[PDB]
Swiss-Prot record:
Parent-record interval covered: 1025 to 1191 of 7096
Organism: Severe acute respiratory syndrome coronavirus 2
Protein's recorded name: Papain-like protease nsp3
Entry function: Responsible for the cleavages located at the N-terminus of the replicase polyprotein. Participates together with nsp4 in the assembly of virally-induced cytoplasmic double-membrane vesicles necessary for viral replication. Antagonizes innate immune induction of type I interferon by blocking the phosphorylation, dimerization and subsequent nuclear translocation of host IRF3. Also prevents host NF-kappa-B signaling. In addition, PL-PRO possesses a deubiquitinating/deISGylating activity and processes both 'Lys-48'- and 'Lys-63'-linked polyubiquitin chains from cellular substrates.
Subcellular location(s) per record: Host endoplasmic reticulum membrane
Catalytic activity: Thiol-dependent hydrolysis of ester, thioester, amide, peptide and isopeptide bonds formed by the C-terminal Gly of ubiquitin (a 76-residue protein attached to proteins as an intracellular targeting signal)
Source superkingdom: Viruses
Gene transcribed to yield this protein: rep
Activity regulation as described: Inhibited in vitro by GRL-0617.
Record note on quaternary structure: May form homohexamers. Interacts with N protein.
Amino acid sequence: VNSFSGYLKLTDNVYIKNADIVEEAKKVKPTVVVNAANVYLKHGGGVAGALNKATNNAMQVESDDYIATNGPLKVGGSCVLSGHNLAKHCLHVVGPNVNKGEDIQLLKSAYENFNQHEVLLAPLLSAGIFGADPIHSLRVCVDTVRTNVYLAVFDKNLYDKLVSSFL
Ligand SMILES: CS(=O)(=O)NC(=O)[C@@]1(F)CN(c2ncnc3[nH]c4cc(F)ccc4c23)CC12CCC2
């Protein structure tokens, strides 16, 4: 039993809700919240900009030190950093950005990072400003992640479309 509330169950291990991931994180305080990161951990907009703002920019300060030490992430890769006031940990995961010409096949590699964590609150990778089809992203999530994933979908219209079209 865990504290996630109001989710629709899609499969044995994948759950979905219409929710603001920032507000969901602040309430649940999950062990892991997933950030829709880029390779530079520049949290300017989308989910990343919203998560960072909610930490009062502490996420960005920590991220800049991480990059200065380690260099950029790989597309499809991840790193574990602090969850600040939102979660114990933040798993920064880089899905491919279609608006940058990145290979969509890397979306499966991106979701594989979730399997290193027993339970996660996450957005749909490569959705939103990353330019991928969220329905596809949901399919890859279901077919790749084996650990327990709670997907927060900000847009109500999109959430209803994801549920209604789910095979
Ligand atoms: C409109 S969207 O639904 O298409 N979402 C997108 O475009 C995104 F940019 C933003 N994302 C979020 N996901 C869950 N909670 C969220 N709270 C937020 C609060 C914000 F001020 C901004 C973004 C989010 C957000 C997902 C996304 C796809 C990959 C990044």
